[model samples]
Target: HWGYGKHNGPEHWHKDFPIAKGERQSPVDIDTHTAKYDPSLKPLSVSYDQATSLRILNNGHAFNVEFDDSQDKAVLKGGPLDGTYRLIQFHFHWGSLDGQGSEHTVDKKKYAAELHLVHWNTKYGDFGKAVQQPDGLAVLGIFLKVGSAKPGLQKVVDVLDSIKTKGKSADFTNFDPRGLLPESLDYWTYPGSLTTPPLLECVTWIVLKEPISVSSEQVLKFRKLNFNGEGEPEELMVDNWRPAQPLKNRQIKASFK
Candidate 1:
């Protein structure tokens, strides 16, 4: 029932979702000065199967590219994680305006958009059960800056036409998620919760320091998404991002100095 409006936006989320004020809430402003380089943090390894990409959907909240998580066919390991984590889905958060759309910021600097690749720790039996554990989720966050067009994002852009309204879904496959990543894997790691409500404090956030570029036009396309269903009163789905929360008592680690 919560939407990104003045009545039910992130500012009001704490009323229903008490965990919104929890110590480890997500999308914290990553101040570079506070981010300490951790030599002990291992390099992350990721391998994604193009076939694992299942479908694309407009869930009223986000444009999600679902994945087949029946097994560990596509996974993320090492670098602040104990065991392998299977990819479940990936989505983006952006704003109505081109100026600031990212959920996480570097020293209060917001990007055009942000991408989140959600994975569940294999140690957990399933996503349902994993969501309850503290280390149950690992999300890879990639910042998307406005620049020249990106080939990888074009695939996603093409499919947006079919699912312009909420609750619409279409078959999507043979897409390599890694194609959207920046050249460097360097990142900022910290303990945090789901950016959206129910705000579970079970995610280990790995936000890449480097950003991938996307044309300003690409972001404009997503802005056309309707938060309401086909017949419902139409409202463009924009500013679907939570602002940076408090860093509180947590230490953010940088993979690179």
Candidate 2:
């Protein structure tokens, strides 16, 4: 039904899912050359512990994470964002093939993948209850590009083999996601919504300016997963990211200044 054609994929998403047309997307064209300087921004801080529940789910599309906020709490300091937030769940977006993973675009530069570190405030009890609050969620967007293979991300990619097929996940019994975060917690803050269905408009977006590098081969393995098992032989999963959305006159504030 939803085959790949001129008007089949993303172009038709809005047709069947009309609400998708109004989603507040990211990865817009940020010409740092003309970006205004804001010197008052602050740096974000996060502490990871063993109690943080990290469960990987086979969402029939890609591997999605279910983070336990009661365990790992991430605090933000400085810049337009100054508050303590809790770590929720972190997931990813990628292409069916390789070299096309990121959901946001800068001008026209597409990257290999986009990792989302989702969180919420403790006032909302937990992620399940926080999903409905206006000040409940904060998502950290990190872009990933394919380059010389680095082991930094292999820890994540390495788990793909056990969960290569759909609904397949190995025991991450002794894993700590904090080790995967980028060096700089500096980010660009903005008001936005979820990129997935329902597209709720309760997200405080924190997109990282610095991108992490992964090997082309590691990305290839990520594209190898699907909802169906390896034997099901479904369509080869390729691009899993949303295209750049209209800026709509919204300004993105950076903490770099």
Candidate 3:
């Protein structure tokens, strides 16, 4: 029911979902100068080799690449997480243009796009249940800048033509998500909630300091996808990112100095 428009965009979300103004919201602006280096923070260990995927769905939101979460094949541990969390899916958020799209900002600077690798705590059993618990979800956010072509992401770009409309999907399997991650694992961590509706305060945000590259051509292809379902008016799927929320005195921790 929530589309990024004047009628139903982020600002009006609070009408139905009051938590939109909650204490711990996500996609906050990350000021590097104010982010403290926490030596107590452990280096994060994330492995994706055994991760399995099935299909890609426009799903009326974003390009959601789902991973089979029946097992703990691809797991994330350490660095702001209490235990192992299994990878469930990865999705994206971008703007109508490359100038400003990413949800979380760096020193007030926006990136071309942002990728969220969503995981749920193994202790919670499933994403549905974990998403309600404060420590249940761990989202790894990677910024995407407009630069040279990245062969790894080209696979995603090539498939966009198939699911140009909502409710459309394709048999997208054997895809290794590690290709989406950057060379450095260094990141900033914070306690936050889902950036989208329902806005549940259950996320442990792990946003990477370094970004991966995606050509502007690749981004143009994404913009072609529609936000509306087939038979609906053409609503180009762009500017899906939520604006930065209030930090409200919560500390943002840095893994590096």
Candidate 4:
């Protein structure tokens, strides 16, 4: 499995998944000054039913809040996209240290953490199929800063103790993902690939301009989660994010000026 370690890190991912070296790789550094303001970009439309939330699990990579995407129970549309996309899961990326965990950096500045809401286009049917096509996925990126504790996140944090090791999972439902977003719907849009192995070039990234707040203490709980399961040696699950990739020739569009 690909990991953030010296032997199996991003540098080694291309060895197995050749696409990791693809031109449209993700988590690029966003230069606000260079981003173009496209007035034609519509306001993002997000509809998430709390009931669609299914469970949460430690996927060894990160803790994911999985959703029921058999149908369009939770979908995103209108912003830099031609069709609807269904939410599959939401997860986070953080560092072992407090100030640098986000995958995408803005003006060369990294945040305390980052949240990724993964979705796939409905035109291609299931996520497994869509993920291989160029226009198959959309991910909403929300930056997290150190501040007061976030009430919405408390629900997620409460369960971390139960799923401390890899492969551990528990039921998680009736939670609205919208509660984790920042107040502004304004975002930057770009075309990129998944930041992980098999690094398919199929993601339409919608990154929010504003960041949500979470207390430093709460952020530390995320680090306590283990990457190694039951009997293995313990390894803290932090710095799970990939480093920024080259921008190449892609242009980032802003929904608002």
Worst 10 residues of 2 by lDDT: 71-80
Every candidate's lDDT:
0.92, 0.66, 0.93, 0.92
Cα lDDT tens digits for candidate 4, 74-178: 999999999999999999999998779999999999998999999999999999999989999999999999999888998999999999999999999888897
Candidate 1 vs. true structure, TM-score: 0.98
Deviation of model 4 at 1, angstroms: 2.6
Model 2: per-residue lDDT, tens digit, 65-121? 665555444443334544557766678888764556687655466678888877776
Ranking by lDDT: 3, 4, 1, 2
Note the clash tally of each candidate.
0, 11, 0, 0
Model 3 Cα RMSD, 1 decimal:
0.7
Cα deviation of 133 in candidate 1 (Å)?
A: 0.8
State the number of backbone clashes in model 2: 11
- What candidate 1 gets wrong by more than 4 Å, as runs, is none
- Pitting candidate 1 against candidate 2, the one with the higher TM-score is 1
Let me know the TM-score candidate 4 reaches against the reference structure. 0.98
Task: Put down candidate 3 lDDT per residue, 1-257, tens digits, no spaces.
Answer: 78799889998999989999999998899999999999999999998989998899998879899989999999999998889999998999998988988999999999989999999999999899999899999999999999987778988999999999999999899998989989999999999999998899999999999999999999999899999988999999999989999999799999999
Candidate 3 clashing pairs, residues 3+ apart or interchain:
none
